């Protein structure tokens, strides 16, 4: 629900945080467009593993210290087409433990 906003042509910011079991004990994260599906992300835009980011493109990057578990996302230069629900998924290990965050971007 909580609308996140940006004007066309701005960078957008979407917050997503998780807590590492311990510093430099990282958990796979993914952002996609569309709400979180059953597994991982729909239309991945960015994917990390335990070590680092392993998938991305130019428009999407992690703007923060993801090694401390700030996996908030920036989107380069938004068009109206970038409007919608973005999934941020923390693939916490163990049974059915995923943390799923849907964040609604709205582009004036």
């Amino acid at each position, epitope marked *: 629900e909580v609308e996140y906003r940006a004007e066309v042509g701005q960078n957008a910011y979407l917050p997503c945080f998780y807590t590492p079991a311990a510093p430099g004990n990282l958990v796979p994260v993914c952002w996609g467009k569309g709400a979180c599906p059953v597994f991982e992300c*729909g*239309n991945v835009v960015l994917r990390t593993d335990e070590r680092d980011v392993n998938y991305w493109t130019s428009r999407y990057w992690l703007n923060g210290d993801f090694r401390k578990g700030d996996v908030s996302l920036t989107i380069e230069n938004v068009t109206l087409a970038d409007s919608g629900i973005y999934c941020c998924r923390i693939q916490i*290990p163990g*049974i*059915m433990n995923d943390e799923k965050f849907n964040l609604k971007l709205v582009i004036k």
Partner: antibody
Amino acid sequence: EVQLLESGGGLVQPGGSLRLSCAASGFTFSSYHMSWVRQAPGKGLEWVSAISGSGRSYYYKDSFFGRFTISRDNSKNTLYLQMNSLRAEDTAVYYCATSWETARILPGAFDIWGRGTLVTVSS
Amino acid sequence: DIQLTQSPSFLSASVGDRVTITCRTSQDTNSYLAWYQQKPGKAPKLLIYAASVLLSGVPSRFSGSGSGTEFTLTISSLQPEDFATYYCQQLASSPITFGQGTRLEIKR
């Protein structure tokens, strides 16, 4: 050729245990969600279990809570299901499956299946 | 669990026919639906996923549409080899669930 080859299927008494294996070839195993999906003879498709690429995240349908454990050995390119407390109605063909072509849009859409291995729960 | 109800359960149709199979979901499933085609003694073959997207290899005479709670698989120009039980599958919420299946036999 992306290939999944289950084995371990066979006859097992109710209450009994069975480990299924799935051998994966022809792709980078350790970067793909793996699922088990099952099908009683003549009947429909039931998703059982999934596991993350890394093999540290596990997923289950409620019916398998506590009974079934999914694991992978990425170095052996092999997927496992440990099935405990098996029941007659667990009698089915067990497929492993992955999202390969699909992964970049919708994981869990299974473009790649195995042959199936039949598990029979009977006295 | 999200229930998927397919209709019809059974369909008999002549080569060249246009046939649609509907799948209704008990909750909003977004676009997170897949269509599979299972021939006897074989594993399901994925035809369509994300509602509308054809797997490479799949004849363009297969098509999907819909979103939310109602989804359609359409086979135009039905062929004999299109005999199969067809399943929808939702990928919106755990557990993954399928429809009961639609069996399509070829009138002849």
